[PDB]
Scaffold this active site. Structure first.
Site, mmCIF file in Angstrom:
data_model
loop_
_atom_site.group_PDB
_atom_site.id
_atom_site.type_symbol
_atom_site.label_atom_id
_atom_site.label_comp_id
_atom_site.label_asym_id
_atom_site.label_seq_id
_atom_site.Cartn_x
_atom_site.Cartn_y
_atom_site.Cartn_z
ATOM 1 N N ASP C 349 0.827 -1.218 0.000
ATOM 2 C CA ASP C 349 0.000 0.000 0.000
ATOM 3 C C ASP C 349 0.853 1.257 0.000
ATOM 4 O OD1 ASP C 349 -1.887 2.098 0.280
ATOM 5 O OD2 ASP C 349 -2.461 1.577 2.313
ATOM 6 N N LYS C 460 -6.777 33.429 -3.222
ATOM 7 C CA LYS C 460 -6.101 32.656 -2.189
ATOM 8 C C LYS C 460 -4.975 33.530 -1.667
ATOM 9 C CE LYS C 460 -4.158 27.940 -1.095
ATOM 10 N NZ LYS C 460 -3.798 26.540 -1.536
ATOM 11 N N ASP C 690 -1.506 -0.256 6.144
ATOM 12 C CA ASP C 690 -1.572 0.662 7.281
ATOM 13 C C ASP C 690 -2.949 0.863 7.925
ATOM 14 O OD1 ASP C 690 -2.299 2.136 4.919
ATOM 15 O OD2 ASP C 690 -2.488 3.798 6.324
ATOM 16 N N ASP C 694 -6.964 -2.548 3.896
ATOM 17 C CA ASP C 694 -6.070 -3.718 3.798
ATOM 18 C C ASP C 694 -6.552 -4.944 4.580
ATOM 19 O OD1 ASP C 694 -3.265 -2.475 2.551
ATOM 20 O OD2 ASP C 694 -3.966 -1.078 4.077
HETATM 21 F F1 BEF Z 1 -2.710 4.035 -0.348
HETATM 22 BE BE1 BEF Z 1 -3.120 2.754 0.412
HETATM 23 F F2 BEF Z 1 -4.153 1.927 -0.373
HETATM 24 F F3 BEF Z 1 -3.577 3.168 1.855
HETATM 25 MG MG MG Z 2 -2.156 3.187 3.064
#
Ligand code: BEF
Ligand code: MG
Lengths: 32, 289, 996
Positions: C349, C460, C690, C694
């Site tokens: 990830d 901005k 994380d 997942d």
């Molecule tokens: F970018 Be990962 F899928 F948290």
């Molecule tokens: Mg991630």
């Protein structure tokens, strides 16, 4: 007589054979 | 999968080169053996073709019976002819080798004392002397049991009886106990040339003692005559006939089972607690009728 | 009908966010600014379930302990114990010897098994003990509105369809429909993997309800601003609630190891019953009456099965997984330790996982030149040249101008991994200041803030004015940061090396092309500008206000852009450089955006600098994308758009015709079918994450990997491994260890097994040629289980015989733990020569005392009769019972001595599978210790007093030891010339037949 073996000395001696070997290794596995 | 039976250019597992795996194994095992076989052939040229290199393990010889029963128990019926046939066929084949016409060739036999004599040293244990004569043995010296034609036969059909025999020990000059006999119970003042045994209702406490014994020996002593000890081995004295010794139990309560230990005494004789048969001898009996 | 439930969970979810707020107000029944009364809300909080996850449905009590009591080998050994007692049977009845013989063995079997399971359960319970000490759930209370009145009740008394008001800092209590908001950026990194903080608003934007703007999501926290909105889904009905449970509700999948365990039980027991059971048929097949012909089977067949190896294994893994326990990476279960070494594909990830999930200054624009900052987490990187004044200026700009501030206890923590209450850009900026140009405590208090202007609505700009502590020009200082395009519009003067200039359209397009160049590298860019005030028009004491223009808005002095991105963990890139070095495909899956994902993955090397995707090949040719052959793009980028719209063989073709794959914009559930897809190839898959997207991909992987601090809670209980320090370099260790521990065990099994050949061969021929019992069981117990214990463990500490990270991963099908060559080795040749010496050891002794070898044929009959006290040898000596049995158990004891002897040769020649032992050497300490200890135990056992009385084993006469000498010798000789010829000519013969 050929009918009486001194079993007690070779016995007192393999035990010596056993410790020394056993302790050499205890000197072999703690190299410090 | 589970179907590699006849694979293309291959049998179950492999096979195209089986001759290779197989041939390697024949040479190899054919060579694993020609090694081992060397080794044991070595081991065979170092064994004294005459004396056992090591004999210490038989240090105390022992007392055996002729009717090597199932468990030293003679249980029979003085009536039924077959109740006692295991036992007397074993007695009939034991001394099959002690009849006087069997031992006719004086070439290998010699006529020794008919009284217990001194140690018949015939030289040294090597082969420099020819084949040694074997002292002879006449069923006579065993009386009332297979002593020839006078009685015996029922071989104990009535009052049970049994021969004790020492274990042939190559070399045993059996030392009997000296005239200062360290408590050897009732025995005659012929402690010089003979080695004794005796039997008991029970071991070392109170005993269901029920028995009157009668012993049969060479000229009438209760033991083993020295003029036949120690044995010179099977290759030097074939057909050798070791002393046998016969003990008889007359007064036996019939429908009850007692025990009997027969011990044998001498500096040259020892005893083991773990082996009831070393130096001593055990038999239980039951004349059930 | 729950698999039908398990299946609408591997499907993308659906909703109803696209309505008029009136159409909203009609369906659920509640008011938009005043809500639902609280007797209606005491009627909805009990119509279903309080806003709460059904607790993890898994609660096995401490009777789960019979799990480590069965399995594959223990339950394959389980029978054995019963078989022993089944063989124990006759002894118990018929007056024989059950008192101390076939009963102790049963106890031993049970005890052995018991130990084996009492020790692989104890650990697997001191590691389910040390991960349940990290779950600090601080429950967070919802601001719920109820009968107008803002009533913040406990997180557990809220309901579908009443308002909730997020401010900054409030965890989001459940899944809402934003009906109003004010500068509300929330952070969903935990739920979908989006990186930078995302704005929240009420209008309807996208359609995939994850990335839309009028919907928040549980477990994510609102970063800044405030919003109002309406609760759509509550409790287990949320999105992270559909995902935790599907995570909870998939199968851990079998590990390649307990598998190499099984196909070993196949061969162990495979021949075990095939030979032994069929071989005692032979016992009765000769002429032995059935009644007592199989009265010894219970025991003779027992030797074939290798009692002891069960313990040797659960330790070879225990020492490995105590070494991984010393580098900060925990295994929830044992067998997973190996898995990594057999990985051919590594999913991984982006956010929270590959990265630090913390915005950090990336690149910088000064003097028409780009400078790359240091972007790591332990400051081991490249620091720019901080000597130019352009830097000094641009610095105090960002330092003065921020709402961001340090917390009290933020001193001894690394300047980066420490905390910052405040914005993201203002956190990462404040961050790169306090690190590159001194401390910000005495620089933000040196300038007195007059009037500030936080982030506005139109244009901005964020601006502030201070006075002059410098001694040169007492003129006033103004500072402003803002968008490149809308600050390039109001600007004119420039700054370089300490002197001003104006906007030339040459460097304005070198600015329009390093904004679009730095911004196109995935980095959110921010311009920085300042100006002096004409201290003649505004004096040294005029406190300005906040109502009207008090100073020139134009002709300012621009300084430089400043870029920021979520940067990888430091140990990431090298970790991967090793990944592919060992030939492991590294694919990237992430729920993040395809331009931030295109820049991070090129940056890591999953996509080596220099494969063009199907898209880089088509804007560069300036042709329609539909024109290029996908065969010519070695890398590829796939928007999870096309992904919903895709089958198997398709997915089959992508993983197949594409080396460097990066998936983007994939829901949590879409990462399953990815794992499952790299799993329709036959390869093994190793997943690392994380947050909570997942949980499904971490559970369905052969092995799942999590993060310890930066992780969440629903993929730290599903993964089969956890990374505590968040150090990603530790994975480089793991594929090295499982591959190594692979190759050592192979030696380890072949050691104890060789024993099994001189083990049984005795129980065999003893039946064949009617000789006495050359080897006893008690003997059989102190090898398989007594002496052979420590050498079979010392072989687990063997080191590497070539470069391990060099050879590609193993083919689960071909390279067998136990392949058919080992047995042709351990059972084939060694154990044979092994049998050869114990039996040679066996004749000398019966011969030397008096029993010649050709004599001993047919003997055992008269010899096992307890009543034949007159037993002639070839020399003519009559032997009682306890006498020749004594000669028996001391033909028991030294055979065992002879064994260890050859077991010396064996252990020394199994130590290396390919290498001569003179090149690998006896550097293994424990192995030396093994030699020493095994001999010592042995020699202690024969000569110890009352040893003949207890175990039926006596002191040896001296001339017995040295009988296994030229055998253990010829053994060492045989395998060493074996392991040399393989070093010379591997291609022809030799290697193919032997090499185990
Ligand atoms: F970018 Be990962 F899928 F948290
Ligand atoms: Mg991630």
């Amino acid at each position: 007589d050929p009918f009486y073996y001194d079993y007690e000395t070779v016995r007192n001696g393999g035990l010596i054979f056993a410790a020394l070997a056993f302790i050499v290794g205890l000197i072999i596995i703690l190299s410090k | 999968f589970i179907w590699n039976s006849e694979k293309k250019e291959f049998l179950g597992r492999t096979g195209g080169s089986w001759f290779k795996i197989l041939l390697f194994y024949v040479i190899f095992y054919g060579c694993l053996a020609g090694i081992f076989i060397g080794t044991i052939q070595v081991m065979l040229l170092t064994i004294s073709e005459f004396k056992p290199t090591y004999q210490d393990r038989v240090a105390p010889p022992g007392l055996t019976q002729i009717p090597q029963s199932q468990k030293t128990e003679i249980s029979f019926r003085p009536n039924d002819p077959q109740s006692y046939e295991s036992y007397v066929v074993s007695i009939v084949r034991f001394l099959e080798k002690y009849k006087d016409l069997a031992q006719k060739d004086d070439m290998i036999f010699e006529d020794c004392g008919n009284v217990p004599s001194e140690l018949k040293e015939r030289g040294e244990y090597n082969n420099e002397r020819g084949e040694r004569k074997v002292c002879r043995f006449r069923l006579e010296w065993l009386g009332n049991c297979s002593g020839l034609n006078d009685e015996t036969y029922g071989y104990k059909d009535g009052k049970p009886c049994v021969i004790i025999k020492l274990n042939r020990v190559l070399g045993f000059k059996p030392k009997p106990p000296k005239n200062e006999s360290l408590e050897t119970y009732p025995v005659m003042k012929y402690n010089p040339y003979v080695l004794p045994v005796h039997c008991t209702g029970k071991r070392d406490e109170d005993k269901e003692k029920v028995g009157t014994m009668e012993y049969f020996g060479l000229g009438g002593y209760p033991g083993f005559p020295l003029q036949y000890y120690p044995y010179y081995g099977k290759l030097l004295q074939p057909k050798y006939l070791q002393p046998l010794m016969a003990v008889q139990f007359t007064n036996l309560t019939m429908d009850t089972e007692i025990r009997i230990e027969c011990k044998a005494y001498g500096e040259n004789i020892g005893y083991s607690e773990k082996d009831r048969f070393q130096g001593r001898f055990d038999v239980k009996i039951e004349v059930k009728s | 009908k729950e698999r039908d439930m398990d299946e609408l969970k591997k499907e993308v979810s659906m909703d109803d966010h696209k309505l008029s707020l009136d159409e909203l107000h009609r369906k659920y029944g509640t008011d938009l600014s005043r809500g639902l009364t609280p007797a209606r809300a005491a009627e909805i909080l009990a119509r279903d379930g309080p806003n709460a996850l059904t607790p993890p449905p898994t609660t096995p009590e401490w009777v789960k302990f019979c799990r480590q009591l069965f399995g594959g080998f223990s339950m394959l050994l389980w029978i054995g114990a019963i078989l022993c007692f089944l063989a124990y049977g006759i002894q118990a009845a018929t007056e024989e010897e059950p008192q101390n013989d076939n009963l102790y063995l049963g106890v031993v079997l049970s005890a052995v098994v018991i130990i084996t399971g009492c020790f692989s359960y104890y650990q697997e319970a001191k590691s389910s003990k040390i991960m349940e000490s990290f779950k600090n759930m601080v429950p967070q209370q919802a601001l719920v509105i109820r009968n107008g009145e803002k009533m913040s009740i406990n997180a557990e008394e809220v309901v579908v369809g009443d308002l909730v008001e997020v401010k900054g800092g409030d965890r989001i209590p459940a899944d809402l429909r934003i009906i109003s908001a004010n500068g509300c950026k929330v952070d969903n990194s935990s739920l979908t993997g989006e990186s930078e903080p995302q704005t929240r608003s009420p209008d309807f934007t996208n359609e995939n309800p994850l990335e839309t703007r009028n919907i928040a999501f549980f477990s994510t926290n609102c970063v800044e601003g405030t919003a109002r909105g309406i609760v759509v889904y509550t409790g287990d009905r949320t999105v992270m609630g559909r995902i935790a449970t599907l995570a909870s509700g998939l199968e851990g999948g079998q590990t390649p190891i307990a598998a190499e365990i099984e196909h070993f039980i196949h061969i162990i027991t495979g021949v075990a019953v095939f030979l032994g059971v069929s071989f005692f048929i032979l016992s009765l097949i000769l002429e032995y009456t059935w009644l007592e012909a199989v009265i010894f089977l219970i025991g003779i067949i027992v030797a074939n099965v290798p009692e002891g190896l069960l313990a040797t294994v659960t330790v070879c893994l225990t020492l490995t997984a105590k070494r991984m326990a010393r580098k900060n990476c925990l295994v929830k279960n044992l067998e997973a330790v190996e898995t990594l070494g057999s990985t051919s594909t590594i999913c991984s990830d982006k956010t929270g996982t590959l990265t630090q999930n913390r915005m950090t200054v990336a690149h910088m624009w000064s003097d028409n030149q780009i400078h790359e900052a240091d972007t790591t987490e332990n400051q081991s990187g490249v620091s720019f040249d901080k000597t130019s004044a352009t830097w000094l200026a641009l610095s105090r700009i960002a330092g003065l101008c921020n709402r961001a501030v340090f917390q009290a206890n933020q001193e001894n923590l690394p300047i980066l991994k420490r905390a910052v209450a405040g914005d993201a850009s203002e956190s990462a900026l404040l961050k790169c200041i306090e690190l590159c140009c001194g401390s910000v405590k005495e620089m933000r208090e040196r300038y007195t803030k007059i009037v500030e202007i936080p982030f506005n609505s139109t244009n901005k700009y964020q601006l502030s004015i201070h006075k002059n502590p410098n001694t040169a020009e007492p003129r006033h200082l103004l500072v402003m940061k803002g968008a490149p395009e809308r600050i390039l519009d109001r600007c004119s003067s420039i700054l370089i090396h300490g002197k001003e200039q104006p906007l030339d359209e040459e460097l304005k397009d070198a600015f329009q092309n390093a904004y679009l160049e730095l911004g196109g590298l995935g980095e959110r860019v921010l311009g920085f500008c300042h100006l002096f005030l004409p201290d003649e028009q505004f004096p040294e004491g005029f406190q300005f206000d906040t109502d009207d223009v008090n100073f020139p808005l134009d002709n300012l002095c621009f300084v430089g852009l400043i870029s920021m991105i979520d940067p990888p963990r430091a140990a990431v890139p090298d970790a991967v450089g090793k990944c592919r070095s060992a030939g492991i495909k590294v694919i990237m899956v992430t729920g993040d955006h395809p331009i931030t994902a295109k820049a991070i993955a090129k940056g890591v090397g999953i996509i080596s600098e220099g494969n063009e995707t199907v898209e880089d090949i088509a804007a560069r040719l300036n042709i329609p994308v539909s024109q290029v052959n996908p065969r010519d793009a070695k890398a590829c980028v796939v928007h999870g758009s096309d992904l919903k719209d895709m089958t198997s063989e398709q997915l089959d073709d992508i993983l197949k015709y594409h080396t460097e794959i990066v998936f983007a914009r994939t829901s949590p559930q879409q990462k399953l079918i990815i794992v499952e897809g790299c799993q329709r190839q036959g390869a093994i898959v190793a997943v690392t994450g994380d947050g909570v997207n997942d949980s499904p991909a971490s559970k369905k992987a052969d092995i799942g990997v999590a993060m310890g601090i930066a992780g969440s809670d629903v993929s730290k209980q599903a993964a089969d491994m956890i990374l505590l320090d968040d150090n990603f370099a530790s994975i480089v260790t793991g594929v090295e260890e499982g591959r190594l521990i692979f190759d050592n065990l192979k030696k380890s099994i072949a050691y104890t097994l060789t024993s099994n050949i001189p083990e049984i061969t005795p129980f065999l021929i003893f039946i064949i040629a009617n000789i006495p019992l050359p080897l006893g069981t008690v003997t059989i117990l102190c090898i398989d289980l007594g002496t052979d214990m420590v050498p079979a463990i010392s072989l687990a500490y063997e080191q590497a015989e070539s470069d391990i990270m060099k050879r590609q991963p193993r083919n689960p099908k071909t390279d067998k733990l136990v392949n058919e060559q080992l047995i042709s080795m351990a059972y084939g040749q060694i154990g044979m020569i092994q049998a050869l010496g114990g039996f040679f050891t066996y004749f000398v002794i019966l011969a030397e005392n008096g029993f010649l070898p050709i004599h001993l044929l047919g003997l055992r009959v008269n010899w096992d009769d307890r009543w034949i006290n007159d037993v002639e040898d070839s020399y003519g000596q009559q032997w009682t019972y306890e006498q020749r049995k004594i000669v028996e158990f001391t033909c028991h004891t030294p055979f065992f001595v002879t064994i260890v002897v050859v077991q010396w040769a064996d252990l020394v020649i199994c130590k290396t599978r390919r290498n001569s032992v003179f090149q690998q050497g006896m550097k293994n300490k424990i192995l030396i210790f093994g030699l020493f200890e095994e001999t010592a135990l042995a020699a202690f056992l024969s000569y110890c007093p009352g040893m003949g009385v207890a175990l039926r084993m006596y002191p040896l006469k001296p001339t017995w030891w040295f009988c296994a000498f030229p055998y253990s010798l010829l053994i060492f000789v045989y395998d060493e010339v074996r392991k040399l010829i393989i070093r010379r000519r591997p291609g022809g013969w030799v290697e193919k037949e032997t090499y185990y």
